[PDB]
Each structure stands twice: as structure tokens, then as C-alpha cells.
Amino acid sequence: AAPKNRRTIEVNRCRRRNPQKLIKVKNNIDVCPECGHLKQKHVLCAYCYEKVCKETAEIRRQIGKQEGGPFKAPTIETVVLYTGETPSEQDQGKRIIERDRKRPSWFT
């Protein structure tokens, strides 16, 4: 196929300036109760997700430093404890993951 004539700026606009191709205004943005960085409905907050990701990164780093090399993963649960906080008498067999700093305002 080959164009027999040249398209016009008017036809180009009518093709690209239609509501179908134009970005639709979404109304799923809401304010998060914590922090405050306008999250989205049915989606987790960005700041909280990044904080949880960093916490998991540090926990995995400490676990690797404790376990040592690969091919480990014992058959016992884990308990993340920060500075201080005497270990509870319930989790006796669960190996402790001594963490630094204090507990945040969302870990329970």
C-alpha cells in the first residue's frame, strides 16, 4: 500500500486529539493516614513500602551474616529483636535476630 495523497494537519489532530488517546483523569488517589504522600486506592503506600523493603533488606543481611554461607535455612522460626527488649519466654527455641536501633511506630 502507498498513500495517494498527503494527510492534513486537521486529520492528524482529529486522529490524535480524540478522547480515546487522551490520558483519562483517574480519581483513585487518596491521602494515606500515615506519613502523607497521597497513596492510591487498592495500592500500598510508596514510603511505607520502601521502609518495609529496607527493613527486610537489613533483616536478610543480618540473617546471611549469621547463617554464613548458602544452603542453610534451619527448621526453626525466627524472631526479630532490636536493641534491648528482653526475649519473651514463649519464643525460646526460635533463634533471635539481634537488630540495632529502636522499634518503629508500626512493628508489633
Name the one range near another protein by CB under 8 A: 2-10, 33-41, 82-90. 33-41
Query: Cell for 23?
Result: 490520558
- The answer to the question of residue 29 lying near Zn ion (CB under 5 A) is no
Window 63-102: contact mask with Zn ion (x via CB under 5 A): ----------------------------------------
| Nearest-angstrom CA–CA distance, 3 and 5 | 5
| Contact residue for another protein among 11, 14, 15, 56 (CB under 8 A) | 56
* Cα–Cα dist 58/46, whole Å: 18
Q: How far is the CB of 6 from another protein (least distance, A)?
A: 18
Q: Which of 48, 52, 80, 97 binds Zn ion (CB under 5 A)?
A: 48
Residue 82 in the binding site for another protein (CB under 8 A): no
Q: Distance between CA 85 and CA 11 in Å, rounded? A: 71
